[PDB]
């Protein structure tokens, strides 16, 4: 076919013919605001680009059809990208987020390959045939690193260099070309970062860079152009195009740029998710973020135990791998203002309250299968799931009640509504047929307990309370936890209400969320913008988990569900044959109960009108 040159400038991507250099035409694209990094896929006849304003990574055919965003979450400054034409994978480097990530060309199965010891990765260049990838870093002390295309064997290829850009690979001649923005020159070396040579140092302001056949192409910020030169000599120079300012990325589009073979190219390595190239031109199977590679070295299994912390416009998942795996933003669309969150370990579904819409919603990890469970005046404050009976307890800030609703939106009814009292924080403990909640009464706040049917009420604590805003509990530890906003402290006691102690009153500003994961107590501080944890074993003391997390709203721990043990709950299957409420005391006693507007009937299963 033919070989044209691609370049990005502001809100459009264009192509200049290399035979007829004056043929400057645009690529039929829409919606682009600030095109930065640029790549392609000759096979699929597709173009790829990142948008640092729109915070996306998009793709489309050269004819402009099938424009689609492939990555639209957790991006800050995606100034590095590269298409893996063999493994059919998409690589990118974010400077704002300090991560080198990977996924499929269509965006699924995203995973972080590099995140530890990363300072401003800018340019990225792949080599699937050899199983290596290279990138420049600007932060701290500029350098060019290398690593297997799975993130392994990371090493500093070039230690002494200025901020480098336009990292390009001469696949045929096996060399690395780049521009040094600080030293102001074009350099070159071998794959080992040796045999280093300066191609040109008398250029006014080189920025972009690429190479094709015997030539190198660069852009000049000051001469406002795209020029060309003998790739080894640096001479025999001509001007391809002039009057081109603010050119971000430049790249030659031709078949001879994406050649070679890979095991990932044959059958994706028989991998269930990601096929990632490694040294020798071999490969390895990779998984999505937080997923684990099974013993068969080819299949992936999702995380079973993890933490969920929410902020105003995002819900995040974090895990505790020794690998130190970084937290991620769940791809859930239309998040306006989340107040609280919970999770269903049985069907792996995420639930949350949205104060903007005054409703309760739910969706899966991957953000699909969305569904609203409660809509409306109604004004949800906090929620807590009974994973056994299969319904959601939640408190309303407007009507001041505790409403119960099936996971399918089907209403059950009200279980607690008394004048003067105001339910706020709530956690259910179905294992013992109880529920704990804070009661922010007009003049006296207290922490209460009751049966899941709203009966058998009793005040656990009434002193040392001005604004109990968060609750948590752990059966194993036999503890009840709460945090007070006004008193700036976290307290604990036994589920019984005995042995009350202050866990921490120092260095606390605004606690809004508590949860128990493993044997630690995690809490979020909305004002300090932190997530901290204390060891309930008293061996590790107090440490910080994350810093600078804006608009923290809630934090929730998820433990793997023991199905063999879950099924043993009498109120689990068919809801114990109960019409509405099914609960089980600690003395084994199980029984059907009813919401306030109904009554238990003669069959002691069904509920009817009084």
């Amino acid at each position: 076919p033919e070989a044209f040159l691609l370049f990005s400038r502001r809100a459009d991507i264009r192509r200049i013919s290399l035979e007829t250099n004056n043929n400057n035409v645009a690529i039929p694209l829409t919606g682009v605001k600030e095109a930065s990094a640029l790549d392609f896929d000759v096979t699929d006849n597709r173009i790829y680009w990142t948008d640092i304003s729109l915070k996306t990574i998009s793709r489309a055919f050269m004819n402009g059809s099938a424009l689609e965003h492939v990555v639209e979450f957790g991006l800050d400054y995606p100034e590095g990208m590269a298409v893996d034409w063999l493994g059919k994978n998409l690589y990118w480097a974010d400077t704002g987020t300090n991560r080198i990530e990977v996924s499929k060309l269509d965006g699924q199965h995203r995973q972080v390959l590099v995140w530890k010891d990363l300072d401003s990765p800018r340019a990225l260049a792949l080599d699937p045939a050899e199983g290596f990838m290279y990138w420049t870093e600007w932060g701290g002390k500029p350098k060019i690193d290398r690593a297997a295309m799975d993130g392994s064997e990371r090493t500093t290829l070039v230690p002494n260099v200025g901020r480098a850009n336009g990292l390009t690979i001469d696949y045929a001649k096996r060399r690395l070309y780049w521009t040094d923005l600080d030293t102001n020159l074009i350099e070159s070396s071998n794959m080992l970062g040796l045999n280093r040579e300066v191609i040109a140092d008398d250029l006014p302001h080189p920025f972009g860079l690429t190479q094709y056949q015997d030539y190198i192409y660069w852009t000049d910020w000051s001469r406002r152009s795209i020029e060309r030169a003998n790739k080894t000599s640096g001479q025999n120079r001509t001007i391809i195009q002039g009057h081109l300012d603010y050119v971000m990325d430049i790249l030659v589009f031709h078949s001879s740029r994406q050649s070679g073979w890979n095991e990932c190219a044959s059958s994706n390595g028989h991998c269930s998710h990601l096929c990632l190239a490694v040294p020798v031109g071999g490969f390895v199977c990779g998984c999505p973020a937080h997923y684990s590679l099974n013993a068969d070295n080819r299949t992936c299994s999702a995380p079973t135990t993890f933490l969920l912390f929410s902020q105003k416009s995002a819900i995040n998942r974090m895990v505790i791998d020794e690998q130190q795996s970084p937290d991620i933003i769940l791809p859930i669309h239309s998040l306006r203002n989340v107040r609280a969150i919970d999770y269903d370990p049985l069907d792996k579904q995420l639930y949350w309250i949205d104060s903007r819409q005054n409703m309760i919603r739910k969706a899966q990890e991957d953000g699909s299968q969305g569904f609203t469970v409660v809509v409306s005046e109604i004004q949800p404050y906090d929620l807590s799931i009974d994973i056994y009976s299969r319904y959601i307890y939640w408190t309303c800030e407007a009507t001041n009640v505790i409403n119960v609703t099936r996971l399918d939106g089907r209403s059950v009814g009200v279980v607690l509504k008394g004048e003067q009292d105001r339910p706020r924080a709530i956690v259910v403990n179905p294992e013992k047929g109880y529920m704990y909640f804070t009661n922010l009464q007009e003049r006296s706040p207290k922490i209460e307990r009751a049966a899941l049917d709203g009966t058998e009420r009793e005040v656990l604590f009434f002193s040392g309370l001005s604004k109990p805003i968060a609750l948590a509990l752990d059966s194993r530890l036999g503890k009840l936890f709460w945090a007070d906003s006004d008193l700036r402290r976290i307290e604990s006691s036994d589920l019984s209400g005995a042995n009350r102690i202050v866990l921490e009153d120092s260095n606390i500003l605004q606690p809004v969320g508590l949860t128990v994961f493993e044997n630690w107590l995690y809490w979020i501080d909305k004002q300090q913008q932190m997530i901290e944890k204390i060891d309930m074993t008293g061996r590790e003391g107090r440490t910080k988990v994350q810093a600078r997390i804006a608009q923290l709203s809630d934090i929730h721990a998820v433990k793997e569900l023991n199905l063999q043990e879950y099924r043993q709950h009498p109120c689990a299957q068919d809801n114990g044959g109960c019409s509405h409420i099914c609960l089980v005391k600690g003395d084994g006693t199980t029984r059907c109960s009813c919401p306030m507007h109904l009554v238990l009937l003669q069959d002691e299963l069904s509920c009817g009108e009084p």
């Binding site: 640092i52 400054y77 800018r122 932060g139 002390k141 901020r163 600080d182 030293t183 140092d201 910020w221």
Partner: protein
């Protein structure tokens, strides 16, 4: 060789503890940064091309890291 403020073209035209950094629309010899001194950290790649008040890099054994928002030259 070039002293501080002297017109230069390449860092080689400057003295030992200086580099050739652009000031407005030409380049002059500027001093390398020392420990504690504020250094440049670009957000967007393009902001590098636009900079007309260029600082020099951090000196030997110094790294441009964030304070614990400015960035200062600190030791590894």
């Amino acid at each position: 060789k070039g002293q501080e403020g002297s017109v230069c073209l390449r860092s080689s035209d400057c003295a030992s503890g200086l580099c050739c950094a652009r000031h407005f629309w030409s380049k002059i010899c500027k001093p390398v940064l020392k420990e504690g001194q504020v250094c440049t950290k670009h957000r967007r790649k393009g902001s590098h091309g636009l900079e007309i008040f260029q600082r020099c890099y951090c000196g030997e054994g110094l790294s441009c890291r964030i304070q614990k928002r400015l960035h200062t030259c600190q030791r590894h």
